[PDB]
Amino acid sequence: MTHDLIEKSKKHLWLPFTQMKDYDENPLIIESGTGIKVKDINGKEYYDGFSSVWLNVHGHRKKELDDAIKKQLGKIAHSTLLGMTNVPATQLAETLIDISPKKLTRVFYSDSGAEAMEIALKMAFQYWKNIGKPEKQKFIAMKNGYHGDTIGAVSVGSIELFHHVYGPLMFESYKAPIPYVYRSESGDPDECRDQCLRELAQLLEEHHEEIAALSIESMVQGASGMIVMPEGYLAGVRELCTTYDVLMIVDEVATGFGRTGKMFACEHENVQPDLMAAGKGITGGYLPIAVTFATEDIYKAFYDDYENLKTFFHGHSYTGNQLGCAVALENLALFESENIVEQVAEKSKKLHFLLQDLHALPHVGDIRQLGFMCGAELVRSKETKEPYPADRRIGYKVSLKMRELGMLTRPLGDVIAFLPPLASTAEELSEMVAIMKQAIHEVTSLED
Amino acid sequence: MTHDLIEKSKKHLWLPFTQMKDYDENPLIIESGTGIKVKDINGKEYYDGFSSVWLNVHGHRKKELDDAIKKQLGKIAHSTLLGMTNVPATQLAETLIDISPKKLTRVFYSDSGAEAMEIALKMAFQYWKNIGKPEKQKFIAMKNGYHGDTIGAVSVGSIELFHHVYGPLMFESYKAPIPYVYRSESGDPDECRDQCLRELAQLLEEHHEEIAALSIESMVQGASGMIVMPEGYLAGVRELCTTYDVLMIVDEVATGFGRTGKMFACEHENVQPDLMAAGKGITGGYLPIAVTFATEDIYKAFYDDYENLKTFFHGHSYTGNQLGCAVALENLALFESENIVEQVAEKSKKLHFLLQDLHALPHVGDIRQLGFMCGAELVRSKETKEPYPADRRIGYKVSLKMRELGMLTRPLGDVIAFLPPLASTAEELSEMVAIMKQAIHEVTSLED
Numbered sequence: 064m065t066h067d068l069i070e071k072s073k074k075h076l077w078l079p080f081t082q083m084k085d086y087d088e089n090p091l092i093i094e095s096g097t098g099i100k101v102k103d104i105n106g107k108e109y110y111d112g113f114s115s116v117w118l119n120v121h122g123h124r125k126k127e128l129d130d131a132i133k134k135q136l137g138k139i140a141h142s143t144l145l146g147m148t149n150v151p152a153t154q155l156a157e158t159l160i161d162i163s164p165k166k167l168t169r170v171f172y173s174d175s176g177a178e179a180m181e182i183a184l185k186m187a188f189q190y191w192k193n194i195g196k197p198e199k200q201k202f203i204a205m206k207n208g209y210h211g212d213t214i215g216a217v218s219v220g221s222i223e224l225f226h227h228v229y230g231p232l233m234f235e236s237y238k239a240p241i242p243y244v245y246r247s248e249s250g251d252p253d254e255c256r257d258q259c260l261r262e263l264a265q266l267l268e269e270h271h272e273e274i275a276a277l278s279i280e281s282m283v284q285g286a287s288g289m290i291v292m293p294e295g296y297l298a299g300v301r302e303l304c305t306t307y308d309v310l311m312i313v314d315e316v317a318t319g320f321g322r323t324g325k326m327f328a329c330e331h332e333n334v335q336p337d338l339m340a341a342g343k344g345i346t347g348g349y350l351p352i353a354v355t356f357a358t359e360d361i362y363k364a365f366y367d368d369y370e371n372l373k374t375f376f377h378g379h380s381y382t383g384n385q386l387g388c389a390v391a392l393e394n395l396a397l398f399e400s401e402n403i404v405e406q407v408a409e410k411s412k413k414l415h416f417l418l419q420d421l422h423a424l425p426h427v428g429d430i431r432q433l434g435f436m437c438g439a440e441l442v443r444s445k446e447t448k449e450p451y452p453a454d455r456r457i458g459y460k461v462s463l464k465m466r467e468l469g470m471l472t473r474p475l476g477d478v479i480a481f482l483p484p485l486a487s488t489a490e491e492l493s494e495m496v497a498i499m500k501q502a503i504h505e506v507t508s509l510e511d
Numbered sequence: 512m513t514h515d516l517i518e519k520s521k522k523h524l525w526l527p528f529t530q531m532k533d534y535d536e537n538p539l540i541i542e543s544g545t546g547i548k549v550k551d552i553n554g555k556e557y558y559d560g561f562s563s564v565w566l567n568v569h570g571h572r573k574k575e576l577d578d579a580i581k582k583q584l585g586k587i588a589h590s591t592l593l594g595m596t597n598v599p600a601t602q603l604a605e606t607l608i609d610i611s612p613k614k615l616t617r618v619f620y621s622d623s624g625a626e627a628m629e630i631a632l633k634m635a636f637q638y639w640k641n642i643g644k645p646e647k648q649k650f651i652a653m654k655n656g657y658h659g660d661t662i663g664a665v666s667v668g669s670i671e672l673f674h675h676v677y678g679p680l681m682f683e684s685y686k687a688p689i690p691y692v693y694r695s696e697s698g699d700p701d702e703c704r705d706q707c708l709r710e711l712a713q714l715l716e717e718h719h720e721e722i723a724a725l726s727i728e729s730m731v732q733g734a735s736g737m738i739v740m741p742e743g744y745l746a747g748v749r750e751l752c753t754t755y756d757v758l759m760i761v762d763e764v765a766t767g768f769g770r771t772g773k774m775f776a777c778e779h780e781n782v783q784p785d786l787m788a789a790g791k792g793i794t795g796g797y798l799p800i801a802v803t804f805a806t807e808d809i810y811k812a813f814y815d816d817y818e819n820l821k822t823f824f825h826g827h828s829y830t831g832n833q834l835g836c837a838v839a840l841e842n843l844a845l846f847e848s849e850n851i852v853e854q855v856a857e858k859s860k861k862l863h864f865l866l867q868d869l870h871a872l873p874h875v876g877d878i879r880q881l882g883f884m885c886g887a888e889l890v891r892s893k894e895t896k897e898p899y900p901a902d903r904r905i906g907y908k909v910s911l912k913m914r915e916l917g918m919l920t921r922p923l924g925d926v927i928a929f930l931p932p933l934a935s936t937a938e939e940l941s942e943m944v945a946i947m948k949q950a951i952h953e954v955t956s957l958e959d
């Protein structure tokens with residue numbers, strides 16, 4: 064009836080980033096969403112406290128967004144961008160160029176964030192080959208960094224739950240140290256920033272001639288536990304990259320489009336990427352579209368007569384999908400007409416105090432926040448900062464507790480993520496912090 | 512204004528698989544489509560003779576497909592498949608399992624064909640270490656194989672012009688030869704087949720204890736020039752993969768969903784893949800949805816208590832998108848109520864005769880076809896079968912002539928690809944083949 068839908072799900076599906084024995088024990092099937100809440104096939108409603116995995120902006124069944132896709136259906140759903148283009152993709156490219164960092168003048172589409180990162184890495188590799196510098200073939204990427212699941216993006220990721228096993232498949236990369244101030248040693252953001260930059264510079268001084276690009280998440284590392292970079296760090300990596308002739312790839316797939324209370328997160332420190340990835344909330348969270356921005360200097364390294372062999376030979380079949388681009392176009396009009404970014408910045412002030420209060424809980428160790436990008440790191444001892452053994456599944460148990468309490472999210476290890484939709488109201492925010500607090504306590508007061 | 516949308520496209524876009532200097536010289540912006548024709552912003556109409564790069568099934572503005580997406584907007588556009596599922600992804604999963612090879616019982620969603628292949632390759636690699644055979648970690652891919660553009664897909668793909676700037680970023684891979692009947696000495700499909708299988712068997716015999724999987728396009732190598740595998744070749748590959756304990760990965764991204772006159776091309780030789788990649792036409796050409804099918808034996812090697820770390824740690828954020836899944840569900844209902852596959856198979860009989868007439872031209876060296884998947888290889892000499900030098904751009908020029916004559920396709924080197932929508936009538940196919948024949952004559956008669 065809907066009983067059968069549940070059994071079908073367990074019989075035919077294989078779900079991303081999930082142990083299916085876990086799914087089969089606690090299955091959940093979503094049927095509709097309205098505002099910032101989704102509804103399962105039984106009629107239970109849940110706050111979407113993780114924005115459907117960090118991509119949902121205006122909430123669900125956002126009226127203008129729905130209208131924008133109906134309008135485009137009435138014209139054409141998809142025609143190709145291989146050797147040509149279409150209207151919404153071209154319009155969107157100009158709108159994207161207008162709001163991104165000033166040095167990024169080019170828009171290369173694809174389907175997902177891993178793909179946009181996969182394209183940034185290939186662009187950066189082929190640039191140096193193109194301009195007669197074929198030795199520049201290694202990458203630097205940051206520890207605790209994550210850039211997607213395909214093999215290039217994996218070669219540049221460093222979350223060892225996900226990646227360690229795939230080492231034989233990975234290309235040659237250096238891993239640079241980032242600040243993780245919470246379980247640091249001095250606990251000072253300036254000291255941690257300066258030490259990690261010092262070590263970046265020494266790595267660069269020794270090997271830059273072999274290195275095409277450096278990859279880094281913009282301001283906040285997400286899959287690693289919503290670890291926010293100390294002030295001045297990102298701008299410090301930009302300078303080091305410029306100085307040692309390494310292209311800087313900035314990953315904005317999670318932080319992009321208002322998430323950190325700027326349109327793009329590298330605005331906090333005014334950094335200009337050479338290459339920049341984006342996805343998730345670009346479409347409001349409706350459809351798979353992704354982008355790699357490039358500078359003009361990069362673009363023209365590939366512009367030449369065709370048998371001069373400059374061409375970038377990459378491109379997915381759905382590249383520039385009109386349906387995706389149309390809803391992205393409306394999304395960005397909503398940012399403008401709603402003043403979304405400003406409202407996120409305002410609402411994050413009070414949210415700040417709401418989140419700092421969780422510290423009152425015995426097993427909450429750290430609270431991290433930049434805008435609407437937050438994590439509560441759970442700890443078996445605040446004093447110690449010693450974490451619970453992984454085998455007690457504390458983050459997992461907390462997610463399940465929140466779920467029965469009517470709120471959806473996913474933990475990053477024992478870090479409880481909180482990335483509520485950008486349209487979230489001040490009262491919705493406090494209603495979600497309250498459920499999260501209740502859940503952490505109920506689970507954690509028993510150290511399950 | 513037409514002229515400034517055109518100048519915006521030259522200014523802010525970087526297109527897929529395109530030398531932007533070629534684009535600038537000959538810009539083309541599509542506005543709408545109706546049935547199997549698309550229309551540019553100047554109002555000029557074109558036959559869609561490459562199905563918008565091999566993905567459009569029913570034409571454009573297909574009413575049923577249109578209704579299906581509108582109906583889904585009215586419920587929800589995207590909620591996550593991480594740790595949970597939704598209604599259309601669940602229903603779609605069931606239907607896909609029913610129409611796919613019987614041994615394939617499991618569906619793992621993604622956004623694109625490359626991502627589906629990347630998933631297949633990561634499943635094969637981790638499968639063997641989950642069951643305690645870490646030795647089995649190498650891949651075999653077929654000479655002239657194309658599996659997508661992301662780094663893992665290109666590590667198992669061999670299109671010299673595409674891959675191998677990127678040599679340094681692969682991942683070593685065993686390359687086996689495919690029978691290329693047209694420019695082979697005997698040729699003779701049976702002689703070719705059996706010798707390429709003798710070389711595979713040799714490769715397996717020596718290295719099979721190191722090999723995780725063999726990766727192969729299903730029945731036709733597309734990007735390499737629409738090269739049809741001889742009868743018995745695919746069934747022999749499968750047999751040798753079984754004999755030597757190597758998983759068979761089958762790429763159906765281009766051939767899948769009716770293209771070759773079967774629902775899946777592997778049905779031609781009755782082959783059961785271990786892992787099967789699909790995409791493109793899965794949605795009728797409307798949206799980016801892809802699938803990796805897996806057997807239950809493979810699924811169950813990642814199925815275990817979370818602490819025994821069996822889990823597949825992979826999954827894009829738009830996995831199981833309701834919008835793509837909804838349109839795909841309706842796409843498949845059409846295959847059923849419109850008997851698309853049987854209609855393609857039937858129409859393909861007369862079509863073969865249209866294409867044999869094409870063969871009458873002095874510079875048409877070969878015609879290749881399986882269902883609606885066709886290729887007309889151009890040669891400067893049809894008795895020596897010598898190719899035009901690349902530097903005289905014969906494929907590119909033919910595609911531009913077809914353009915002005917009102918038809919879109921893309922060449923593969925000097926092979927003119929012909930992949931018309933599956934809804935194409937008998938009349939429309941002959942209209943299309945005639946425009947293609949005129950354009951080959953007008954370009955090629957001037958080139959000696």
Ligand SMILES: *Cc1c(COP(=O)(O)O)cnc(C)c1O
Pocket residue numbers: 174175176177178180209210211212280285314315316317318342343826827828829
């Ligand atoms: C989401 C994420 C990705 C991967 O994007 P997908 O669409 O899931 O493939 C890449 N980089 C960052 C920083 C991300 O947050």
Ligand SMILES: *Cc1c(COP(=O)(O)O)cnc(C)c1O
Pocket residue numbers: 378379380381622623624625626628657658659660728733762763764765766790791
């Ligand atoms: C189209 C294709 C791919 C890649 O799919 P995308 O959606 O373009 O990334 C991979 N393998 C084959 C055989 C294909 O035809």
Ligand SMILES: C[C@H](N)C(=O)CCCCCC(=O)O
Pocket residue numbers: 145378379380528564659660734921922
């Ligand atoms: C567009 C998609 N990446 C695809 O697989 C098509 C095959 C390669 C396309 C090369 C061309 O048509 O110019």
Ligand SMILES: C[C@H](N)C(=O)CCCCCC(=O)O
Pocket residue numbers: 080116211212286473474593825826827828
């Ligand atoms: C969904 C997408 N692959 C993404 O970037 C999130 C990765 C980290 C999420 C880990 C989890 O939620 O379990």
